[PDB]
């Protein structure tokens with residue numbers, strides 16, 4: 225649930 | 236005598252242009268690193284394997300805009316979901332070669348109209364190719380493409396957004412700075428600014444049909460790459 229997108233945004 | 240960019244606008248143009256160039260595949264080396272694809276689910280396979288790096292470059296582009304970074308992550312998620320396919324489409328359309336009648340994807344794969352269409356995009360392939368063809372006489376430079384990307388990224392009308400007005404303010408900055416650059420560039424095309432705004436609508440329609448077709452394309456979901464599913 226946006227977990228990959230969330231990871232890529234907060235790096 | 237139409238207004239040319241302010242100093243603040245020139246700084247914004249530098250920021251967004253540099254963000255675009257740093258995240259545009261083989262910016263320099265795309266024409267030569269390009270290989271033509273020969274000849275459904277099998278082109279689905281080469282097109283799935285390349286979508287994920289294309290999404291990632293869009294994410295990188297957004298993350299180099301300081302305006303984007305002051306937004307809450309849940310708004311960033313909505314904005315990126317709304318504009319990946321519009322930006323990726325634009326990035327392919329400006330890489331139309333009339334001679335080969337190809338678009339280049341990921342700075343490396345040249346596809347034809349039939350390849351992209353049979354490959355799985357359907358009528359949206361015709362929409363992206365016809366945008367590429369009509370962008371030829373526009374002669375868009377890196378700055379104009381970056382500003383088009385910034386304008387699509389900063390869409391307030393995206394459903395679920397918290398900072399709807401902060402976003403519209405950011406967009407209005409990019410739009411003003413973009414028009415001023417256009418006034419300054421003096422393209423030899425009548426009503427260039429009104430016509431570029433119509434191209435923005437063309438990309439927004441591509442954004443919504445990709446959405447429409449993804450619904451219809453569900454073919455089990457573990458077959459589609461994870462990040463693609465996140466950005467529908």
Ligand SMILES: COc1nc(C(=O)NCC(=O)O)c(O)c2ccc(Oc3c(C)cc(C(=O)c4cccc(C)c4)cc3C)cc12
Nearest residue numbers: 260282283285286289323324326327340341354355459463
């Ligand atoms: C916008 O145009 C595109 N641009 C780029 C790109 O690199 N742009 C240039 C640049 O960024 O410099 C791509 O890499 C694309 C990859 C697939 C694609 O279109 C699709 C195709 C040709 C098939 C399907 C599918 O059938 C499918 C279904 C589920 C999952 C997946 C990954 C694919 C979906 C899409 C978006 C469209 C792409």
